[PDB]
C-alpha cells in the first residue's frame, strides 16, 4: 500500500525558518534595542562624542546625530529597525532629537 | 535566546573600540605618520 | 565475524579447555597445539628472571651485544637502569625491575650505578632508563615525571613496556589484561 | 509513530509485511523447487576462497549462503533444525511454508482474518496426527528382513546420487545397519557409524570395513606393518615428557652430575614401559605368529618409539576421543588409563591388522573381528566436493534408515501421504469437527497446499503436472468401491502412477510428523505478523 | 536479518513520492502538527492580540495580526495547512473581514474532533453531522438579530459598525481612526434625500496615502488625493481663479507621431529653414485652443516633452505625470471629467471642476494636494496617515481596508444586520446546538455536540489574552444566560473583570451577520476537506 | 559562546506537546498487540538475531528511541515484568491514554501540571477501592479453577490450542517450586530448549537435564538408584596458591615429583570412595588419570558443570555444595534419585536425572520444550513466564479480579459517577481518568472488528443494571458476562497497571523544558 520503505514527517514551517514561543523572544527583542541604545548613550548631550562608522564599501562617514548612523548600519533584526524608522521619521518631520 | 545573535550584517569583520585605550591608538597612529615626515 | 575468532583468540591453553564440550575436537585441538607451541617458545626464550647487576666493563659485554641475541632475528630487549642511591625515583625504579623480572623472564633487566655509567653524569638527570634492541637504542627515557614521578606504580611501568614493543598488548601477564578471578566470577553470574 | 521517535528507521505495516513474507517465501521456494526429487538439478557453492562443495541438501544451501531477509532466516532455522535431529525432510519444510503462505494469502486479500485461518491449520493438523495412526503399517523387527532395509536405503540415495553410486553404496549402509540391531535394541548412530575422508581411485570404489580404521600408522620403518593376531591395549597416559607443575632447574654442579640428572628423564618413561614389558611377558607365547599393538590418545615421545620398535610392538599415537570409545566395541576388550593395574582380560582381539600408505599419509586397517559390536564406513572419493557430496548423502541416509528401527512403523511416500490427506480433509464431515465460522477455507487451503509437493517432483521431469494426476484421482475413486486397500505413487520415468509397496519407495515416520508441525508453526507465526521494523543501538 | 527487502512496490512510484495514508495514522499526524499554527492565530486574536513579524525571502518585513496577511508569506510545506491558507484568503478578497475566526474555527473543529475519531466514529458520518449542523447554524442566526439598520447614511450610526472593527486591530486608537473612516464614507456617499436601488460602492474609492512622521492624532481627511511628486513650472494662485478645469489626456502632449517609425526627409534647404518654426507653430495651433477655454491644469500619463511644457509655463497651466494607469482614473472621479486620448479641444461637458490645488510638505517631502471645498465628489476619498514607523502604518492600511471592506459587505447585499459581540452570540449557539442534538436520535448526535464545543475558544481566547483564569469567568458566564437581558451578556476586558459581566450597549461592540455566516461556511468547508481526505501524496522538492 | 547548551531550547507549551505526542506514539506501535486476536511483531536487532513476539515488554526491549520522554515510557515494561510477569502491554497502552486525555486540559484550559497530580492520587485511592470491591475471592487448592486461571493469559498467545497441556505443564512446575508465606522464584525454573519435536509429547520431568555425556565409555549408562555427590574443585593436580620452585639436586627427585602427582590424585579419589558414590559431578574440569580409579569403585565422571546447574542439583538430590574433599561424609551425599539415562539426539548428548518423588528445601525441575524451530522455542518460553507469573499472584493474594476489561470499566463508571459530586477545580482532571479506562475495552473491540460506538454504549447501560462482571467477548465481539465466559485474571496485575500508569504520568507531567547535548 505504501510507496516505499519509510516516510519522514513533514516540518510545518519551511526548513531553516526560525521561530520561538514564550517570553524569551520579547526579552531578546528588548535587549536588541538596548544593544543599539548603548551605542547612542554617550552621544547625547553637548559634551557627547561622535561615532565613526565604516561600511563594507570602505567609505568613511563620521556623524553625531543618530539619523545617518542607523542608516549606515544595515539592521537585520526587525525590533532594532524600529529605532531606525523613528529616527528617519524624526529626521524627516522635525530634524532634531533623533538620538533622544 | 538562541546561539545566533545578529543585529547588523557581517559582524565578524566589523569590530568596535571604546574607552581610553581606543583613543590612545589614534594619537599614537598620528605619531607614526608625523614621524615619517618629521625629517 | 569476530564472534568466531573470540573462541580461540580470547582463550589461553587453560581457558581453551572450557570449550571441550561445546566446540568440535578437531577445531579446538588444532588451535591448542598451536598455542602449546607458542608457550614452549617462551620457555626457551626465558634465559633471564632476575636483575643483572653489572660492572662498567661488562656494560658492553651484557648490554649491546646481548641485545643482538641469536645474531632468525632473535632480538632481545635490554632495560638498563642508571641507579643512584641518593635520588628518590631510583629506588622506586629498582623495585619495579625486581617485580618485572619475576614475570617477564624473556626480557633482560640490567642495573648499574649512574656514576659508573657516563663520564661525570648530571645527578639531576638521574634515574635514567635505556632500552637496547639489536644494538640500537629504542628509547632514552628521562626521569619519571612522565610516568607519574614519585607516585609511579607497577601498572604504569607495564604500560611503558607495551609501547616500546617489548610485550604484546593482549598478553595475559599484564595487569591490564590479567583480570582477577573474582572479576570473571561476577561476570559469569550476571551473564 | 516511529519517525518522530527514531530519527532513522524503516517500517512496513498491514500490506507490505504480508507481501514480504509471501514474496520472500515464493523466492526461497523457487530456489529449492528444482532440487526436490530424484531428477532434480545439482547445486554447487563457491565462496571467495575458491573452494568447491557440491550437494543437493537444502541445509547446506541455507547454512552457507548469507541471507538478509527476516523471513528466510526463520525458514533457514526451521529447515536446519528439522534436519539436524531427523536427518531428512529439509526441502519439504521449505515447500510447505513456501506454499502454505501463498495459498492462504489469496484469502487474506479476500478479507478473511489471519487468526481464524491459522485456527483452521491447527485443528487440521490434529486430524493429520489421527490419520498417521491409521495410515501407517506395523512391521516386526524379529524377521530381520535385509531386503526391506535395502529398499529404504535406495529411497534417499537415489535422490542425491545416480544409480551407479546408489547400487555400490547401498549395501555399505545395510551392512553397517545390520549390526545396529541387538538384544538391547538401543540405537547408537554417532559413536558406531562414522565417516572419514580419503582421496583415492574413485567414488565407486567405496568398500565396507567391519573394524575401526585409523588415519595414522607406524612412524619407524623397522616397526611391523602387517600383524596377524594383534591384541590391542588402550592407554590414555601420555608417554612423552611432562613439565611438572612449577618444577624448575636440575641444578647441576659438576659436569658428571649434569648428565646424571638428564638420565632421570628416561626413568619416568621407563617406569611405564616396564609395565608394558611385564604385560608382554604374560602373552609372550607364539610371539612370531601373534603380535601386540598400543594405541594412545595423547602423543608419544620419539625417544620411546625405539623401545616399541625393538620388541616389534606397533605404536599409534594421538587418537581421537571417539576412537577410544569404539575400540571396546570392535575388539571386545576393555579400556585402561593407568599402567599400575593390568590384566589379560582387558586386551582385545583382532584377526587381521595391516597398513597401506599413499603419498605422505598412511592409514591403518583393522578387521576380521570375532564379534564386532561396531564398524565404520570408509568412503572413497576423487575431489573435495565429491567427499562433501558423499558426506551429505551418507549423513542423510543413515539417519533416515536408522529411524525405521527406532519405531515399529514406516510411512510410504511418493505422494501417497499428501494425496491421502487431500481426500481426507476435503471429504470429512465438518460437523464432527469443532471449527465453525470462516474456517471453511482454512481446511481447503492447507489441504490444497499439500498437492504442490508431489507435482514438484513432476516439474523436474518436464511432464504436465496437472495431467498425470488425472488417472491418480480416477484410481482412488474406484479403489474405495473396489474393496481393495492400495496406495498409489508417482513414477517419473513413464509419467504414470505406481505402488510404493512393491517399488520400494518409503519414508520415515518422524520426518513427515515433525515437518508439518515445524512448518505449521512457522507459517502460522508469519501470517499473524502484520508489521516489520528495525531499531537498535549500533 | 540485516537489510530489509526494501518494500517490493519500489518498482512503483519514485522515492520522492511520500504516502501518508490512514490507518497508518494520517489524521493523528495532521490535526496535531497544525496545532502550532493554530496557536499563532489564537494568540493574535482579540483586541489584546499580539502581532507577528513575518520576514519573507526578499526581506520586506511586515507586522500584522491577522491571518490572511501572515499565511500569504509563510512558505508552508505541509499540504493540509494550505487548505486553511487560501480558505482564509477567500474571506480576505470577498468580505475582507473574519480571517481570524476562520483560521481559528476551522482548526478547532479538527482539534475537537479528536474525540470522535479516537472513539471510533465513522469519518463519513462526521461530514454529514457538521453539514446538518451548519444548516441549523445559518437558520438560527437570523432570530438573534437586534440591530436592523435601514438608514446607513449618517456618521453616528457607523459608530456601531466601524469602531468594533477598528477596536480589534490596535485597540488603543478608536475615536481617531473611526473619525477618519467614517468621515471618508460620508464624503464617498452622495448627498441625497433617498439613495436606493443598491448604490454602487467599491474598495478602490477610499485610498490610503502613507506619510512618514507625525503623531496619529495630527492626521486629517482629504477629499482628493496626495501624490509624492514634484510640480513643475510655476507656483499656484490658491485663491484667485476660485475654480479650475482639469483635462486628463491619456496620450502625451506632443506632435502626433505614428506607431510605425518615421524620420525627417528634406529634399532642399528651404524646408530646413521652416522646420524649426514648423514644430513650434504646430503645437501652438493645438495648445492655443486649450488655453482659450481656460483649462488651468493638464494631466498627461506618458512623458511630456519640453516643447509642450514651455508653452504651458507662460500661461500658468499645471502639469503632472501620473505614470501608473490605475491611479490615473481616480483623479478623473474627483474633478468629474472623462479621459481623452485625442487632443481635440476642451469641451464644457467633458471637463470637470476643481476648487484649488496647493503644494507643501507634510513629512518633509513635497507633495501635491487636490483638496477642494464646496465641490461635487462621487466615490473618492483619502486618509492621510501620520506615524512614527512605516511598519506600523502598513497595519493601519490593512485595518482601513478591512473597515471599508465591511462597508462593501453591507451595501452590496440587501442587509448586513448586526449581532451581539464580545462573546455573546457564540455561547448562545452552544445552547441552541445542545438542544438541537437531543431532538434527532441517531449515531450522529456525538458530532452535533462536538460541533458546539468548537465555539468555546471565542470567549476564552479574549480571557487568555486578558490574563484571566478561563475556569472562572467562562463557567460564571453560563450562569448569566439562565432565564432581553440574557442575550447581551459578554466577556469583559478590564481590571474590574472579576465579576465577568459587562453590558454590550455601554460601548456598542457588535459583529456582522453576513461575515459570520460566510466564516462559518468556509470554516466548515475547510474542516470538511481535511476530514474527508485519507491519503496525502507528496513529491520531490 | 557560552556552555554546551542552547542549541534549540524547546520551552513553554510546545515542549509538553511533543511529550504527549511522543508518549502516544509508543502506545500506537503496540496498539494491535492486545486482546485474543492480537498480531505478532518481528523486530530486527542490529547484531543479527530476530525476536518474534507480541508481548509489549519484549517488543520495547529491542526498540531504541532517541527521545528522553519516550524512554521513561520504555522503562515501565521492566516495572511490570520484574514485579508480576503479566500485563506489560496493558501498562504501556493505559498510560498513553492517561497522558493523552489530560492533555486537552494542559493545552487549553490551563490547569497547571500540579493540580492534575493532586486529582490523580484521589483517583488512585478510589481506583484501589473499587478494584478491591469488584474482585471476588477464589479457592487456591481447586485444581479445576486453577487450570482455567492459568490459561487466561495463554489465550492471548499462540499456544491456546495446546492450552490443555500448558496448564498441566505450568501447574506441576509451580507446585514443585512452591515452598510451604508461599514464596517462589523463577531462578531455578530451567529454560533449557530442545529444537524440534511435537508439543504433545513434551512434558515436565522432575529433576535436571544436562547437555553433556560421561567421559569414559565403561561408565554405567543406566543406574537404578544414583547417589550424586557435588564437587567444586577440579580433579587435576592443584598447582597451589604459591609457586613451588623445587630445587632438584638428586636424580631420584624428579621421578618422585611426578610420582606424588599420581599419589595426590589417588588420595583425593580414595577418600571419595569411602562413601562409594555412583555419580560424581565436578564443577571445574577433570583429569584423565583420576577417572579410571573412580571407575574402579563404580562412580561416574562428567565434564565441567557450571554452578548454576549444580545449585539445582543440590536441591533435587538433597546434596550440599562441597569443595573440601577431606571433609566428605555420608550425610551430605545425595540420595533418593529416581533414574539415570542418556538419550541420543543429533545436536548434543543429554543426561536425564529423575527423582523418586518421595518438609524441607524446595524442589527444582526442568521443563521440556519440543517446538518447531528456534524462534518457536523462545516464543513458547516467554509464554511459560507469562503463564507461570499468573500462578504466583493467586497464592500471594487469594483475590481474583474480573477480566475482559470489566475491572478497568468498573473504575471508569465509579470515577464518572463520583466526578459530579466532586464539584471544584479538581473535577476536570478527575473526570478525564474515566475517559482512558474505557479505552482498554475499546482496543479489544477494534481488534475484533466490531463498532466500539454502540458496544460501549450498550456496555455502560448494562454495567449499572446487569452486573459488575460484564465484558466484551474478544473472539465473537458481543457482550458476554465473565461468570459464564469462565475466564478470570488475578487482581494484582490490575493494581500494578493502575499504579504504574498513573505514577508515570505524575513524573512526565512535571517536564518543563528539554535540553540535549550537555556532556557525557
Ligand atoms: N546650552 C544648553 N544648555 C543646556 N542643555 C543643552 C544646551 N544645548 C543642548 N542641550 C541639551 O542637550 C541635549 C542633546 O542635544 P543635541 O544632541 O545637541 O541635539 P540632537 O540630539 O537633536 O542632535 C538636548 O536634550 C538638550 O536639552
Ligand atoms: N525414486 C523416487 N520415486 C518416487 N518418489 C521419490 C523418489 N525419490 C524420492 N522421492 C520422494 O521425494 C520426497 C523427498 O525425499 P528426500 O530427498 O528424502 O527428502 P527432502 O527432499 O525433504 O530432503 C519423498 O517424499 C519421497 O517420497
Ligand atoms: N471593548 C471591547 N469589549 C468587549 N469586546 C470587544 C471589545 N473590543 C473588541 N471586542 C471583541 O473582540 C473581537 C475581535 O474579533 P475579530 O477577530 O477582530 O473579528 P473578525 O474575526 O470578524 O475580524 C470582536 O468579536 C469583539 O466583540
Ligand atoms: N479472551 C479475552 N477476551 C477479552 N479480553 C481479553 C481476553 N484475554 C485477555 N483479555 C484482556 O487483555 C488484557 C491483557 O491480557 P494478556 O494479553 O494476557 O496480557 P498482556 O497484555 O501482557 O499480553 C487483559 O487486561 C484482559 O482484559
Ligand atoms: Mg540637535
Ligand atoms: Mg532426503
Ligand atoms: Mg475584524
Ligand atoms: Mg498476558
Instruction: Print the SS3 string covering E138-197.
Output: HHHCCCCCCCCCCCCCCCHHHHHCHHHHHHHCCCCCCHHHHHHHHHHHHHHCCCCCCCCC
H-run or E-run covering D378: strand D376-378
Region label for D464, one of left (φ > 0), alpha (ψ between -120 and 50) or beta (otherwise): beta
Q: Are E245 and E296 in contact (CB under 8 A)?
A: yes
Q: Are D487 and D499 in contact (CB under 8 A)?
A: yes
Q: Are D416 and D488 in contact (CB under 8 A)?
A: yes
Q: Are F402 and F463 in contact (CB under 8 A)?
A: no
Q: Are E235 and E330 in contact (CB under 8 A)?
A: no
Please name every residue paired with F339 in a beta bridge, in sequence order, or none if there are none: F354
> A19 to chain F: nearest residue by CA?
F8
Asked whether residue F30 falls in the same domain as residue F73, the answer is yes
A contacts of B2 (beta carbons < 8 Å): 18, 20
Ligand 4, closest atom to CA F405?
27
Pairing state of beta strands D529-534 and D10-13?
Answer: antiparallel
Give F79: exposed, middle or buried? Use CB within 10 Å, 0-12, 13-18, 19+.
Answer: middle
Task: Quote the ligand 2 centre to F130 CA distance (angstroms).
Answer: 65
Indicate yes or no: CB of E1 within 8 angstroms of CB of D532.
Answer: no
Using the Cβ of F198 and the Cβ atoms of chain D, whether some distance falls under 8 Å is answered with yes
How many CB atoms neighbour CB C69 within 10 A?
18
Rounded-to-integer distance, Cα F360 and Cα C131, Å: 67
Backbone angles phi, psi at E516, to 5 degrees: -75, -35
Q: Are D427 and D476 in contact (CB under 8 A)?
A: no
In D227-297, which ranges are E strands? 229-231, 234-235, 290-296
Task: Quote the ligand 5 centre to A99 CA distance (angstroms).
Answer: 8
The three-state secondary structure class of E252 is: coil
Using the Cβ of B10 and the Cβ atoms of chain A, whether some distance falls under 8 Å is answered with yes
> A22 to chain F: nearest residue by CA?
F12
Asked whether residue F214 falls in the same domain as residue F350, the answer is yes
Pick the residue whose CA is nearest to atom 21 on ligand 3: E98
Asked whether residue F356 falls in the same domain as residue F212, the answer is yes
Amino acid at each position: 500500500m505504501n510507496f516505499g520503505s519509510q516516510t519522514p514527517t513533514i516540518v510545518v514551517l519551511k526548513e531553516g525558518t526560525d521561530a520561538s514561543q514564550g517570553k524569551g523572544q520579547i526579552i531578546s527583542n528588548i535587549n536588541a534595542c538596548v544593544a543599539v541604545q548603548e551605542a547612542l548613550k554617550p552621544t547625547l548631550g553637548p559634551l557627547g562624542s561622535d561615532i565613526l562608522i565604516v561600511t563594507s564599501n570602505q567609505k568613511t562617514t563620521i556623524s553625531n546625530d543618530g539619523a545617518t548612523i542607523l542608516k549606515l548600519l544595515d539592521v537585520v533584526h526587525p525590533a532594532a529597525k524600529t529605532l531606525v524608522d523613528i529616527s528617519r521619521a524624526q529626521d524627516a518631520e522635525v530634524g532634531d532629537g533623533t538620538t533622544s | 535566546m538562541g546561539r545566533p545573535f545578529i543585529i547588523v550584517k557581517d559582524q565578524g569583520n566589523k569590530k568596535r573600540q571604546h574607552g581610553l585605550e581606543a583613543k590612545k591608538s589614534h594619537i599614537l597612529a598620528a605619531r607614526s605618520v608625523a614621524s615619517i615626515i618629521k625629517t | 565475524a569476530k564472534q568466531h575468532e573470540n573462541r580461540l583468540e580470547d582463550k589461553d591453553l587453560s581457558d581453551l579447555e572450557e570449550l571441550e564440550d561445546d566446540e568440535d575436537e578437531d577445531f579446538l585441538e588444532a588451535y591448542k597445539i598451536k598455542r602449546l607451541n607458542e608457550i614452549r617458545k617462551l620457555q626457551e626464550r626465558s634465559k633471564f628472571g632476575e636483575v643483572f647487576h653489572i660492572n662498567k666493563p661488562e656494560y658492553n659485554k651484557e648490554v649491546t651485544l646481548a641485545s643482538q641475541g641469536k645474531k632468525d632475528d632473535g632480538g632481545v630487549y635490554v632495560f638498563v637502569h642508571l641507579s643512584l642511591q641518593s635520588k628518590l625515583q631510583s629506588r622506586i625504579l629498582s623495585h619495579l625491575f625486581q617485580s618485572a623480572a619475576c614475570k617477564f623472564r624473556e626480557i633482560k633487566f640490567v642495573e648499574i650505578p649512574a656514576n659508573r655509567a657516563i663520564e661525570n653524569y648530571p645527578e639531576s638527570n638521574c634515574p635514567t632508563l635505556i632500552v637496547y634492541y639489536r644494538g640500537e637504542v629504542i628509547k632514552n627515557m628521562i626521569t619519571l615525571l612522565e610516568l607519574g614521578g614519585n607516585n609511579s606504580k607497577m601498572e604504569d611501568f607495564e604500560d611503558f613496556m607495551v609501547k616500546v614493543g617489548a610485550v604484546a598488548e593482549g598478553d595475559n601477564r599484564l595487569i591490564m589484561n590479567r583480570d582477577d578471578e573474582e572479576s570473571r566470577e561476577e561476570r559469569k553470574l550476571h551473564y | 509513530s516511529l519517525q518522530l521517535l527514531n530519527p532513522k528507521a524503516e517500517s512496513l505495516r498491514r500490506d507490505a509485511a504480508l507481501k514480504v513474507n509471501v514474496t520472500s517465501a515464493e523466492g526461497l521456494q523457487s530456489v529449492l523447487e528444482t532440487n526436490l526429487g530424484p531428477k532434480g538439478t545439482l547445486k554447487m557453492l563457491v565462496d571467495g576462497a575458491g573452494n568447491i562443495k557440491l550437494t543437493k541438501d537444502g541445509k547446506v544451501l541455507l547454512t552457507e549462503m548469507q541471507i538478509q531477509s527476516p523471513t528466510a532466516v526463520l525458514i533457514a532455522r526451521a529447515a536446519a533444525a528439522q534436519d539436524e535431529i531427523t536427518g531428512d525432510g529439509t526441502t519439504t519444510v521449505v515447500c510447505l511454508v513456501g506454499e502454505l503462505l501463498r495459498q492462504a494469502h489469496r484469502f487474506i486479500q479476500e478479507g478473511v482474518h489471519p487468526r481464524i485461518i491459522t485456527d483452521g491449520f491447527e485443528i487440521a493438523r490434529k486430524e493429520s496426527m489421527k490419520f498417521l495412526d491409521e495410515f501407517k503399517i506395523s512391521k516386526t523387527n524379529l524377521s530381520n528382513d535385509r531386503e526391506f532395509l535395502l529398499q529404504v536405503a535406495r529411497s534417499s540415495l537415489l535422490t542425491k546420487v545416480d544409480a551407479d553410486l546408489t547400487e555400490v553404496l547401498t549395501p555399505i549402509v545395510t551392512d553397517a545397519v545390520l549390526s545396529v540391531y541387538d538384544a538391547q535394541a538401543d540405537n547408537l548412530d554417532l559413536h558406531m557409524v562414522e565417516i572419514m575422508q580419503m582421496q583415492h581411485l574413485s567414488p565407486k570404489d567405496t568398500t565396507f570395513i567391519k573394524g575401526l580404521v585409523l588415519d595414522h600408522g607406524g612412524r619407524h620403518p623397522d616397526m611391523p606393518t602387517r600383524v596377524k593376531n594383534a591384541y590391542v591395549l588402550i592407554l590414555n597416559v601420555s608417554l612423552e615428557y611432562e613439565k611438572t607443575e612449577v618444577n624448575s632447574g636440575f641444578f647441576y654442579s659438576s659436569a658428571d652430575q649434569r648428565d646424571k640428572l638428564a638420565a632421570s628423564e628416561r626413568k619416568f618413561v621407563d617406569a611405564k614401559l616396564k609395565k608394558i614389558i611385564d604385560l608382554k611377558n604374560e602373552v609372550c607365547g607364539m610371539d612370531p605368529d601373534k603380535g601386540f599393538v598400543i594405541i594412545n590418545q595423547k602423543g608419544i615421545d620419539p625417544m620411546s618409539l625405539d623401545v616399541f620398535a625393538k620388541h616389534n610392538i606397533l605404536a599409534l599415537r594421538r587418537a581421537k576421543r571417539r576412537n577410544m570409545e569404539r575400540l571396546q566395541l570392535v575388539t571386545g576388550g576393555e579400556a585402561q588409563n593407568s599402567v599400575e593395574d593390568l590384566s589379560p582380560q582387558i586386551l582385545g582381539f583382532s584377526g587381521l591388522v595391516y597398513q597401506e600408505t599413499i603419498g605422505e599419509e598412511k592409514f591403518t586397517y583393522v578387521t576380521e573381528n570375532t564379534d564386532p559390536k561396531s564398524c565404520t564406513i570408509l568412503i572413497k572419493g576423487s575431489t573435495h566436493y565429491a567427499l562433501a557430496q558423499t558426506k551429505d548423502a551418507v549423513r542423510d541416509g543413515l539417519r533416515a534408515v536408522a529411524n525405521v528401527l527406532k519405531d515399529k512403523n514406516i510411512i510410504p511416500g511418493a505422494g501417497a501421504f499428501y494425496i491421502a490427506l487431500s481426500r481426507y480433509l476435503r471429504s470429512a464431515n465438518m460437523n464432527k469437527l469443532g471449527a465453525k465460522g470462516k474456517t471453511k477455507t482454512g481446511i481447503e487451503a492447507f489441504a490444497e497446499a499439500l498437492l504442490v509437493i508431489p507435482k514438484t517432483l513432476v516439474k523436474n521431469s518436464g511432464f504436465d503436472p496437472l495431467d498425470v494426476l488425472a488417472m491418480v484421482e480416477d484410481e482412488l475413486d474406484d479403489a474405495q468401491d473396489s474393496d481393495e486397500t492400495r496406495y498409489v505413487g508417482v513414477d517419473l520415468n513413464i509419467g504414470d502412477s505406481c505402488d510404493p509397496t512393491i517399488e520400494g519407495i518409503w519414508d520415515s515416520y518422524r520426518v513427515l510428523r515433525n515437518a508439518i508441525t515445524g512448518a505449521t508453526g512457522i507459517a502460522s507465526n508469519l501470517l499473524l505478523c502484520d508489521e516489520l521494523l528495525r531499531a537498535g543501538r549500533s | 536479518s540485516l537489510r530489509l527487502p526494501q518494500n517490493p512496490n519500489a518498482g512503483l512510484f519514485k522515492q520522492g513520492y511520500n504516502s501518508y495514508s490512514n490507518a497508518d495514522g494520517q489524521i493523528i499526524k495532521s490535526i496535531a502538527a497544525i496545532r502550532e499554527l493554530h496557536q499563532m492565530c489564537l494568540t493574535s486574536m482579540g483586541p489584546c492580540g499580539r502581532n507577528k513579524i513575518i520576514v519573507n525571502h526578499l526581506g520586506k518585513i511586515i507586522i500584522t495580526n491577522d491571518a490572511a496577511t501572515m499565511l500569504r508569506e509563510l512558505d508552508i510545506v505541509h499540504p493540509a495547512v494550505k487548505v486553511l491558507v487560501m480558505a482564509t484568503e477567500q474571506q480576505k478578497i470577498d468580505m475582507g473581514d473574519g480571517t481570524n475566526l476562520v483560521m481559528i474555527l476551522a482548526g478547532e473543529l479538527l482539534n475537537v474532533s479528536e474525540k470522535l475519531i479516537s472513539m471510533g466514529l465513522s469519518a463519513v458520518e462526521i461530514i454529514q453531522g457538521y453539514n446538518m449542523a451548519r444548516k441549523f447554524t445559518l437558520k438560527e442566526l437570523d432570530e438573534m438579530v437586534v440591530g436592523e439598520i435601514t438608514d446607513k447614511n449618517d456618521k453616528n450610526e457607523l459608530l456601531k459598525m466601524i469602531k468594533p472593527v477598528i477596536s480589534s486591530k490596535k485597540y488603543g486608537s478608536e475615536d481617531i481612526l473611526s473619525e477618519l473612516v467614517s468621515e471618508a464614507v460620508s464624503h464617498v456617499l452622495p448627498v441625497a434625500q433617498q439613495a436606493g436601488e443598491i448604490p454602487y460602492f467599491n474598495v478602490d474609492s477610499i485610498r490610503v496615502v502613507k506619510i512618514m512622521g507625525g503623531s496619529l492624532s495630527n492626521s486629517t481627511v482629504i477629499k482628493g488625493m496626495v501624490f509624492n511628486r514634484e510640480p513643475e513650472g510655476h507656483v499656484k494662485s490658491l485663491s484667485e481663479d476660485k475654480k479650475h478645469k482639469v483635462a486628463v489626456f491619456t496620450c502625451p502632449l506632443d506632435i502626433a507621431n505614428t506607431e510605425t517609425k518615421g524620420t525627417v526627409l528634406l529634399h532642399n534647404a528651404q524646408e530646413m529653414l521652416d522646420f524649426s518654426k514648423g514644430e513650434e507653430k504646430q503645437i501652438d495651433a493645438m495648445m492655443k485652443e486649450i488655453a482659450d477655454m481656460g483649462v488651468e491644469c493638464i494631466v498627461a500619463g506618458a512623458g511630456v516633452g519640453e516643447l509642450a511644457l514651455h508653452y504651458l509655463n507662460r500661461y500658468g497651466i499645471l502639469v503632472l505625470k501620473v505614470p501608473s494607469k490605475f491611479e490615473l482614473r481616480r483623479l478623473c472621479r474627483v474633478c468629474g471629467a472623462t479621459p481623452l486620448p485625442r487632443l481635440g479641444a476642451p469641451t464644457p461637458e467633458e471637463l470637470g471642476l476643481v476648487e484649488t490645488v496647493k503644494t507643501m510638505e507634510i513629512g518633509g517631502d513635497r507633495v501635491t494636494v487636490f483638496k477642494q471645498e464646496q465641490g461635487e465628489i462621487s466615490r473618492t476619498s483619502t486618509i492621510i496617515l501620520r506615524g512614527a514607523t512605516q511598519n506600523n502604518l502598513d497595519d493601519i492600511e490593512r485595518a482601513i481596508d478591512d473597515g471599508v471592506a465591511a462597508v462593501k459587505g453591507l451595501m452590496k447585499p440587501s442587509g448586513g444586520k448586526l449581532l451581539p459581540g464580545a462573546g455573546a452570540t457564540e455561547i448562545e449557539l452552544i445552547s441552541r446546538i445542545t438542544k438541537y442534538g437531543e431532538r434527532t436520535p441517531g449515531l450522529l448526535q456525538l458530532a452535533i455536540k462536538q460541533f458546539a464545543v468548537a465555539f468555546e475558544v471565542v470567549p476564552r481566547t479574549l480571557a487568555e489574552t486578558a490574563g484571566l483564569d478561563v475556569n472562572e469567568v467562562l463557567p460564571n458566564l453560563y450562569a448569566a444566560h439562565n432565564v432581553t437581558d440574557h442575550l447581551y451578556k459578554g466577556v469583559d476586558i478590564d481590571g474590574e473583570s472579576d465579576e465577568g459581566v459587562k453590558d454590550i450597549r455601554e460601548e456598542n461592540i457588535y459583529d456582522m451577520l453576513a461575515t459570520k455566516k460566510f466564516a462559518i461556511n468556509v470554516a466548515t468547508e475547510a474542516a470538511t476537506t481535511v476530514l474527508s481526505i485519507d491519503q496525502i501524496i507528496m513529491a520531490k522538492k | 559562546v557560552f556552555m554546551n547548551a542552547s542549541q534549540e531550547r524547546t520551552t513553554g507549551r510546545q515542549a509538553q506537546i511533543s511529550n504527549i505526542t511522543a508518549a502516544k506514539a509508543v502506545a500506537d506501535v503496540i496498539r494491535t498487540c492486545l486482546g485474543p486476536k492480537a498480531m505478532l511483531k518481528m523486530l530486527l536487532d542490529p547484531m543479527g538475531g530476530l525476536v518474534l513476539t507480541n508481548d509489549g515488554h519484549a517488543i520495547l526491549r529491542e526498540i531504541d528511541v532517541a527521545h528522553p520522554a519516550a524512554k521513561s515510557m520504555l522503562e515501565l515494561s521492566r516495572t511490570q515484568d520484574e514485579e508480576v510477569g503479566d500485563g506489560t502491554t496493558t501498562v504501556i497502552i493505559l498510560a498513553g491514554e492517561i497522558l493523552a486525555q489530560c492533555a486537552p486540559y494542559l493545552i487549553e484550559k490551563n490547569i497547571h501540571p500540579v493540580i492534575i497530580i493532586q486529582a490523580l492520587k484521589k483517583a488512585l485511592t478510589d481506583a484501589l477501592e473499587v478494584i478491591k470491591q469488584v474482585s471476588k475471592p477464589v479457592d487456591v487448592e481447586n485444581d479445576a479453577a486453577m487450570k482455567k486461571l492459568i490459561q487466561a493469559s495463554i489465550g492471548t498467545k499462540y499456544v491456546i490450542h495446546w492450552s490443555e497441556k500448558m496448564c498441566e505443564l505450568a501447574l506441576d512446575a509451580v507446585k514443585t517450586v512452591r515452598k510451604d508465606f508461599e514464596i517462589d522464584i523463577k531462578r531455578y525454573v530451567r529454560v533449557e530448549k530442545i529444537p524440534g519435536g511435537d508439543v504433545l509429547d513434551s512434558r515436565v520431568l522432575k529433576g535436571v537435564l544436562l547437555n553433556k555425556d560421561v567421559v569414559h565409555p565403561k561408565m554405567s549408562r543406566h543406574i537404578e538408584n544414583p547417589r550424586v555427590v557435588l564437587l567444586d574443585c577440579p580433579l587435576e593436580y592443584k598447582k597451589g596458591e604459591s609457586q613451588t620452585n623445587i630445587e632438584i639436586e638428586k636424580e631420584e627427585d624428579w621421578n618422585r615429583i611426578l610420582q606424588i602427582e599420581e599419589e595426590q590424585v589417588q588420595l583425593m579419589c580414595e577418600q571419595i570412595l569411602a562413601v562409594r558414590p555412583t555419580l560424581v559431578i565436578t564443577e571445574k574440569g577433570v583429569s584423565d588419570l583420576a577417572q579410571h580409579y573412580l571407575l574402579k569403585g563404580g562412580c561416574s565422571v562428567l565434564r565441567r558443570v557450571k554452578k548454576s546447574d549444580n545449585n539445582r542439583i543440590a536441591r533435587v538430590t538433597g546434596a550440599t555444595i562441597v569443595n573440601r574433599v577431606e571433609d566428605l561424609k555420608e550425610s551430605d551425599v545425595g540420595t533418593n534419585c529416581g533414574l539415570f539415562k542418556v538419550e541420543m539426539i543429533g545436536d548434543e548428548y543429554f543426561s536425564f536425572l529423575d527423582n523418586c518423588k518421595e518438609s524441607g528445601l524446595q524442589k527444582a525441575c526442568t521443563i521440556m520444550l519440543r517446538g518447531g524451530s528456534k524462534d518457536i522455542l523462545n516464543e513458547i518460553d516467554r509464554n511459560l513466564q507469562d503463564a507461570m507469573a499468573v500462578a504466583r499472584n493467586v497464592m500471594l493474594s487469594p483475590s481474583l479480579s474480573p477480566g475482559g476489561g470489566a475491572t478497568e470499566m468498573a473504575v471508569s463508571v465509579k470515577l464518572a459517577e463520583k466526578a459530579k459530586q466532586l464539584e471544584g477545580i479538581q473535577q476536570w482532571p478527575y473526570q478525564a481518568v474515566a475517559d482512558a479506562m474505557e479505552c482498554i475495552p475499546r482496543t479489544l473491540i477494534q481488534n475484533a472488528g466490531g463498532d466500539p460506538i454502540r458496544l460501549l454504549s450498550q456496555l455502560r447501560a448494562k454495567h449499572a443494571q446487569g452486573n459488575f462482571t460484564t465484558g466484551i467477548d474478544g473472539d465473537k465481539g458481543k457482550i458476554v458476562d465473565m461468570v459464564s465466559y469462565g475466564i478470570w485474571e488475578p487482581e494484582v496485575i490490575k493494581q500494578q497497571s493502575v499504579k504504574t500508569a498513573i505514577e508515570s504520568a505524575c513524573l512526565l507531567l512535571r517536564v518543563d523544558d528539554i535540553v540535549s547535548g550537555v556532556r557525557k
